[PDB]
Design a protein around this ligand. Structure first.
Ligand SMILES: NC1=NC(=O)C2=NC(=O)SC2=N1
Ligand SMILES: NC1=NC(=O)C2=NC(=O)SC2=N1
Ligand SMILES: NC1=NC(=O)C2=NC(=O)SC2=N1
Ligand SMILES: NC1=NC(=O)C2=NC(=O)SC2=N1
Ligand SMILES: NC1=NC(=O)C2=NC(=O)SC2=N1
Ligand SMILES: NC1=NC(=O)C2=NC(=O)SC2=N1
Ligand SMILES: NC1=NC(=O)C2=NC(=O)SC2=N1
Ligand SMILES: NC1=NC(=O)C2=NC(=O)SC2=N1
Ligand SMILES: NC1=NC(=O)C2=NC(=O)SC2=N1
Ligand SMILES: NC1=NC(=O)C2=NC(=O)SC2=N1
Ligand SMILES: [Zn+2]
Ligand SMILES: [Zn+2]
Lengths: 163, 160, 166, 168, 170, 170, 168, 171, 167, 175
């Protein structure tokens, strides 16, 4: 309901942007652009709308938005954890990436959020979150909690297996 | 086999597809035979040197027990023997018995490591399963593989 | 659409499969499996629900299009990549729409050879271009390649398409 | 002058976008965002501010980093450009080939159009024996490759094979 | 060749393999060699299983099946040679099931072979079965690699077709 | 230990067993390409087991990596080929780098089990040089690879030494 | 300052062309004294700037670096990899690159240049640890790698292993 | 000549000392005291190819290639070095060139104030004039985004088989 | 012949001992005592080819390890040979193709001559429709010499195929 | 130390031995191409052993590495050249060495009749004696013509031997 009500307001602002750039919004290729740009921005912010072995999900494709300039940034996320008593469904790990990445973000915050989500949900022995992105030269942010921070064997294993 | 083929014929009809098509006439039997091969590990029981022994890149083919969709990957096994050494052909047979079942990657990894441990009673074991159901890597480190940093670093490096 | 009416009939057949495999369908991890397996099979054949419907002097290529299809012989999925190229005559297709053509035909009970012919004909009929090139590589790998018009007849064109998809 | 006058109008529209997303525009990290976004959008469309105004060998400039804007959704698309030409009587300074890429890429584009524009700009500037322009970009994990072959690059099989091999 | 012939000849192969172990200045009664004459006999039977099968039992686009794992035996020294087979064809009116394509390779490769002959044998099988416009067979093996290549019909005569085959197999 | 007189005397006995194998496989031993095969196979088997004819008697990490290894599976008499990576920290005696490869050759040219081969190379070095530590890695293909690793002395006990060996051999 | 700095540089570059044995009035050499002076100004622009302008490891790798050899005035080019574990202050990722640019755009020595980047970060953020890796190919086939590890990056084996692995 | 270099060395060092003073730095610094002389000597080494003459430096029927020849030239526009690789190929007619001498050809033209296009052409012409071959191929790839310049003469230009072969063998 | 090699071996070791002395080096050092005989054996092995004599599908043997000697300075050069042939009515055993390479490689060579010799040996032995010989050696810069005879020179399809398959 | 007078005097004695080698190989020394070979071989052998003519005599807080140094030496067992790469690393105490001079140390010791184990040791000792650093790491990876297989010799001194963090870092950064 919030998206359907805000969609016109976004398209109105996108039409204003086209006009403010010294461009004609009534052009053939630019007629549908305010609506399309609004729909795209809605998709990039849809997140605002859930054993005794190391479990890793590497190369998770991640699409987020720079909260400073409103320019997207793509990347990859590699999550790892050592369960205590609760295990998370591998599809749900990707949903955690998606909820936080589809938002006006900062890579450092986005990493911290994915690690905290896992920690709070499973209460595991250790968690490892690596985000490697190219912002529109790479930026790598890494969160190591529990046994992932304290155990050299555990951290070396996580870092090696995600390569 | 005829009960599986009957269910596969029902699936073809339920999908808005003509089961009497040229290419779909033998499909209920072929699909039933394929599903039997993907679950052949149920027909088998596990009952059938002072150095690190590794067998890497073991091709694994398994079936997700949630959606009945195959998942394919590779298994890397390593162990430090105590008094019993396993024939390298038999390590692959353990992977085949558990992978040809309706599996969950985590359980499959747990099973292959326990099978080795119970069979050889080794100083340590290391089982790594990397599969594509974005990749999922599950790793079991038992004994000296868990406790010795030198041993674990060596297994992980040699499987690359 | 009709997938709402056939969903319980597909779930029933999947439960029969679980029982026929010497497995307990009332297991913790196998309880909602007849529903999940039925929903998965409907997603792998969603291309049947869509129609062919849709809406420059240079070679246009879209390579590494992820393809997921289902072998019509054994009902086992086959996965690959599609590489499409064309030289327009007067009509150009939106690059997003090229991928939607791949999706319509790949989400069905297919044979790789038929699939690639299906995409090739869809583009030809839609744009009426000077040439078309469709390469499907799926999994030992199987590569099927359709070269039409200037892509078949011009050696320079075909070499260019094949080089640019690498 | 046009940019300085339109900058507050762009920032006003960007502040409206922040509010329309269910986000607090008075947040610490979002206070300067309408101005920063407006300045960024101005840089992505700076091409509009600019105007396009003996040898016997193939000249190539490959892996030219390209940053452009999808005219359809206003989402950036990034790739690389490979340019080649066989001169007739006029040769272009290798720095200037990249400036042609920049003028056309810093606009609301369609990959096909941008590719054609670079090739026509070179053809009109040098009047060469042939031009080759390959643009590969990532806008679903797949790449889009557009290719313009003019003159001897289109007609000579030896020339086209050589260009395509040397850009690899 | 039949399964009855194999079961009857298996003890005669194991007897010859035990004689080989003894002739090498090796103790056939040591732990690791107690089952070796029979394992060697069974292995040799598997490397020559293609003799048990017959070729009889087994669209306007190029159809290629690349990276087909091949395991064969050198008929000169009885030492295995391993490689990869790349097959391609342009159909006329008959198309072969892609599973059956690699089954042609398993028939000729599981015999006492010479790479050149095995390559020719594969290409002729496809040509005789389908009667296609063109065929292409490439065998690359390590007995320094040995590559044998057969190009028939449109694959030999059309430069565009051969270039396409050779590029797509890479 | 085996000698050249033993080989010349056992050669017809090996060829006789190889002729029996050809006949037992449902194959014509009088074929053009199979006439000399019993002798060629016997000569090849003698070369694969030539290590039986030889005896081992005749302040920095030192590594010799990518040593080509060719051995014979003692279970089925089928060759297995791989690579050996050797490393050692000398105490007072250094071995000529050519001689490290000769140790590989003596043990690999025999009916082997990969684990045994690795142990033998490591023990031969240890006994010859009496070094601070030894490292022997054998990676072989008998699509799946088998890696065996022996770490003795400072290579087993020092984490710095083992990490260094393992990294330098890549 | 830079207005009255560039003419003196172009004058010296014209003198160099004449001293080499070249004709500075040649077609391709007419603009060369100014272009060379503008290039040398760009390689030393870091003199014009001052440095005054979460619980996780933060890395920025593959930063392109262009510097001047202070011994022979020959450019040296490479990459910088930066990492840090914050205490209470985090630096904007754009600003890390500006520190690289400030010190690299000077008459440098790779060792000094590396040390300067690390000290600038340490003094600005006061972090738990810092890691700086500079790889470069000088014109003085062989590569020069310089590495500074401060705080927890020097003392913690887990921390250093991780930064060195993540920069690959 | 060597006399010209010795006489112009203090004039180059004087201009380099002026450059140090014009960048915003102290020329009397410990590490910058010898810099005007070192920079002058470096610039002399980058232009040593002006001191050499091509003159200063048999029937086969096969393509002869020398690939991955390290090249270090100086851009004549900004006096900034450009570095790359040269790939040379030729089909001899009656004379063959010593493989060491092909690298000396690269050195004489690359150690000058160049434009990559001119540098490629000079090497190709030097080979053509020296051997009088059936064909010549010169592919220079440098980083001043890479710049590739290619000269195809004789049978290398006219024969499609010859050009495809040279281009494939240099990979 | 093998008799000539065994008889010339002490004359080579004598010359190698003289070389050690002429270099301002102690020929009586621990590591240099066996060097004149080892250097002699090595040079003999490098020129081993002198004692030997030259006695419907594309056939290729690629990545043949080649070890030769530069006839100008007596310094070894090492590379790889790729051979291809299209037979007329005569086929050569793949083991024998490598023996031809060994014959000519193991001499005081010039890469250009060595490529011509391998190609001529195949041509004369089989009388094929075409021959292709590629030698790539390092005497950071590599030297590639290529001989294309018959159908390999004349047919563009044949040459493209040979060049592609040797990669 | 060897000198230019020693080289000029020994050149005809080297060429005489090289002419004897040509004759002993069943080859015609008077061939058009082999006429200058005894002199050229003697001159080449003099260049491969030019390091005998030279003598070694002629605060930073960071690891300094120079990797991929092209090395060209001569196996003292068979007089066959061996070619490889040298990777040098050091942690300075108070003195830093000019990066050009690190390569000159490689050249002085590689241009001699060597054994890789010795050459590695010699470069490490030369650096240690010159700078007196906290640690030194020298890796040589070469391919010998004693057939094919690579030989890697590694010297770790000071903090490079004793500190696991230092050794892991050097080994990772030379890759
Ligand atoms: N694979 C694995 N890695 C660990 O680090 C670990 N720590 C544990 O306690 S159990 C375990 N398994
Ligand atoms: N290679 C090797 N790796 C180990 O980790 C080990 N542990 C032991 O007890 S014996 C041994 N050998
Ligand atoms: N890039 C390009 N390649 C062709 O093959 C072609 N043929 C044409 O007619 S227009 C064109 N452009
Ligand atoms: N490299 C090169 N390739 C060509 O195709 C060409 N054609 C010409 O006329 S000049 C030339 N140079
Ligand atoms: N892809 C393709 N390649 C050919 O070479 C060809 N020849 C034909 O007749 S139909 C065809 N399709
Ligand atoms: N490279 C090297 N690695 C070691 O581990 C070692 N230990 C020692 O005592 S001397 C030495 N050198
Ligand atoms: N990724 C990560 N690496 C560290 O070494 C570390 N040390 C800490 O205290 S918090 C932390 N995160
Ligand atoms: N390798 C080679 N390639 C050619 O194109 C050629 N043309 C000739 O006339 S002789 C020759 N050798
Ligand atoms: N594979 C193959 N390639 C050729 O080029 C050829 N030419 C011929 O005459 S027969 C043949 N087979
Ligand atoms: N990069 C670097 N690595 C070390 O291990 C080290 N140890 C020190 O004492 S100073 C230093 N710098
Ligand atoms: Zn898009
Ligand atoms: Zn310049």
């Amino acid at each position: 309901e919030d998206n359907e009500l805000n969609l016109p307001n976004l398209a109105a602002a996108y039409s204003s942007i086209l006009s403010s750039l010294g461009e004609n919004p009534q052009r053939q290729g630019l007629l549908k652009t305010p609506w399309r740009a609004a729909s795209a921005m809605q998709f990039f912010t849809k997140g605002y709308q859930v054993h005794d072995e190391m479990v890793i999900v590497k190369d998770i494709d991640m699409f987020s938005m720079c909260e400073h300039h409103l320019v997207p940034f793509v990347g990859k996320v590699h999550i790892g954890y050592l369960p205590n008593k609760q295990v998370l469904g591998l599809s749900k790990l990707a949903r955690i990436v998606e909820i936080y990445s589809r938002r006006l973000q900062v890579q450092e915050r986005l990493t911290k959020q994915i690690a905290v989500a896992i920690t709070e949900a499973l209460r595991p022995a250790g968690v490892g979150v690596v985000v490697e992105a190219t912002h529109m030269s790479k930026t790598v942010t890494s969160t190591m909690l529990g046994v992932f921070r304290e155990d050299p064997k555990t951290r070396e294993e996580f870092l090696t297996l995600i390569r």
